[PDB]
């Protein structure tokens, strides 16, 4: 059959320029008289329209989203993309490129929606702190211990322990807004306490916005 | 300015039949094709019936729609409850191109066993110090019911400025988990004796206190 | 209340728990197929539209 | 048993513990007001007639 992929990156800053692409695979844009639109979807919203085209220069454009929508289809690398202009923190949804022949009827092949919430013009590194367990971190014969995902911008963190090694009882909590913006997590693992000070436990935190990848060792507690 | 009036919650028990109307305010429904889409959360949408009358071929025969142009609602009769057709329904028109969607129409069935809120607690690192910063993680974990209330506390001393927690949330072995953060300077960190975190839930009282050592 | 077995008086309240047939079944005027009490429960819940 | 919400087709079998529903009122499957547990025991006795 055929099959839609989205490319481009999942963030955007506020008043600038968005540069989504969906590529066509099993499949030929100008063959069939095919059309290619656009569907946005905001996390707990309906989904809304945003704009179809033909593979000629044909195309139509939400009045709520016109003068805004500029959508190119180059047939030689079978593909379509679209550059929205002036992005808001309103515009915050999950984007579908949407695979669609009757121009009433339906969008038959859905691709993948790609997560893209547009940022608060504050994407930092995150910083990765360890949670060194101790005596008073135990509560009978297992113990607990992790690192600390503070001050870092936007979602999401992926978080792993010993390069996914480690898997049971590994817990990753929601983040929750700061007092100023910022965003902070953790995530933990609970381990019997005999493999404290034999086993070496890394957590590595990832932050694909900023490209940072951070590797923090975590150890019992040294009293000073 | 033709827009789908369709309900925000419509729920049944399962085995029943239902119906879901997408209303047109100022175009009538019967000028264009409708279509419905049932959409699982966090996944791509997918048509669960077009041209108003007939199926998509992989669908149950239960999804049938019908039109009734005089009071300009669009109907789907939707009969047999199952688990998973817990899911958003949207409703489709065109107007004059110029797609419109719907509202929104999803359904939910209205299960944890209880548990004991173990918690642990851990004092600010060293290299969180060196970067003159301070955290103290307080973590709530594997409990039920997901409702507990976190309360710092410093040298005998209530802690409210830069508390911060998370709702309860589920885990792998069917229970919740929880945290809270007390952002703090370094200098305030030293200058009480302890401090403790206080997790009060279903009326008993787990504590647990850390000191600069 | 969702079954009757025929209209009812108006200012009248009916608070009969007894067999109402949907059908014709006798089933000793307590219960069996085709026999019900009216009753019947809400589906009420604060989360609801 | 003695109790059935429906007629049953011939040459079956009918093991369902659930509370039958003397009223159409729900209870959670429990014995309650118009609901009644739809097995009971026999009163069998050697000195019977």
């Known amino acids: 059959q055929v099959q839609l992929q989205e490319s481009g990156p999942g963030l955007v800053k506020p008043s600038e320029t968005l540069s989504l692409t969906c590529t066509v695979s099993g499949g030929s844009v100008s063959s069939g008289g095919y059309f290619w639109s656009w569907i946005r979807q905001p996390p707990g919203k309906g989904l809304e329209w945003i704009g179809c085209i033909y593979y000629s220069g044909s195309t139509n454009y939400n009045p709520s989203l016109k003068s805004r929508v500029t959508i190119s289809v180059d047939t030689s690398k079978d593909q379509f993309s679209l550059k929205l202009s002036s992005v808001t923190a309103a515009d915050t949804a999950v984007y579908y490129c949407?695979?669609?022949?009757?121009?009433?009827?339906?969008?038959?092949?859905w691709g993948q929606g790609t997560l893209v919430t547009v940022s608060s013009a504050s994407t930092k590194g995150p910083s990765v702190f360890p949670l060194a367990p101790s005596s008073k971190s135990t509560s009978g014969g297992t113990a607990a211990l992790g690192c600390l995902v503070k001050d870092y911008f936007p979602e999401p963190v992926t978080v792993s322990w010993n390069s996914g090694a480690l898997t049971s009882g590994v817990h990753t909590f929601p983040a929750v807004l700061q007092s100023s913006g910022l965003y902070s997590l953790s995530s933990v693992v609970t381990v019997p306490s005999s493999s404290l000070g034999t086993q070496t436990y890394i957590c590595n935190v990832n932050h694909k916005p900023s490209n940072t990848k951070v590797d923090k060792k975590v150890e019992p507690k040294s009293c000073d | 300015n033709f827009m789908l009036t369709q309900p925000h919650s419509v729920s049944e028990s399962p085995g029943k039949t239902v119906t879901i109307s997408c209303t047109g305010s100022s175009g009538s429904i019967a000028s264009n094709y409708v279509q419905w889409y049932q959409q699982r959360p966090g996944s791509a949408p997918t048509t669960v019936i077009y041209?108003?009358?007939?199926?998509p071929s992989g669908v149950p025969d239960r999804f049938s729609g019908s039109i009734d142009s005089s009071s300009n609602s669009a109907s789907l009769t939707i009969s047999g409850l199952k688990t998973e057709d817990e899911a958003d329904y949207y409703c489709?028109?065109?107007?004059?191109?110029?797609?419109?969607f719907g509202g929104g129409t999803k359904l939910t069935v209205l299960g944890q066993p209880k548990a004991a809120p173990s918690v642990t607690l851990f004092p600010p690192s060293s290299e969180e110090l060196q970067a003159n910063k301070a955290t103290l993680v307080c973590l709530i974990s594997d409990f039920y019911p997901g409702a507990v209330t976190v309360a710092w506390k410093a040298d005998s001393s209530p802690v409210k400025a830069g508390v911060e927690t998370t709702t309860p949330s589920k885990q792998s072995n069917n229970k919740y988990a929880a945290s809270s953060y007390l952002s703090l300077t370094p200098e305030q960190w030293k200058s009480h004796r302890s401090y403790s975190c206080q997790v009060t839930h279903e009326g008993s009282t787990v504590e647990k206190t850390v000191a600069p050592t | 209340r969702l079954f009757r077995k025929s209209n009812l008086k108006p200012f009248e309240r009916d608070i009969s728990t007894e067999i109402y047939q949907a059908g014709s079944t006798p089933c000793n005027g307590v219960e069996g197929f085709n026999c019900y009490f009216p009753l019947q429960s809400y589906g009420f819940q604060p989360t609801n539209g | 048993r003695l109790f059935r919400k429906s007629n049953l087709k011939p040459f079956e079998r009918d093991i369902s513990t659930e509370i039958y529903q003397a009223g159409s009122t729900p209870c959670n499957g429990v014995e309650g007001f118009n609901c009644y547990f739809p097995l009971q025991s026999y009163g069998f006795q050697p000195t019977n007639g």
């Open positions: 489709q028109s065109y107007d004059s191109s110029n797609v419109v």
């Open positions: 041209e108003d009358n007939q199926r």
């Open positions: 949407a695979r669609q022949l009757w121009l009433r009827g339906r969008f038959d092949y």
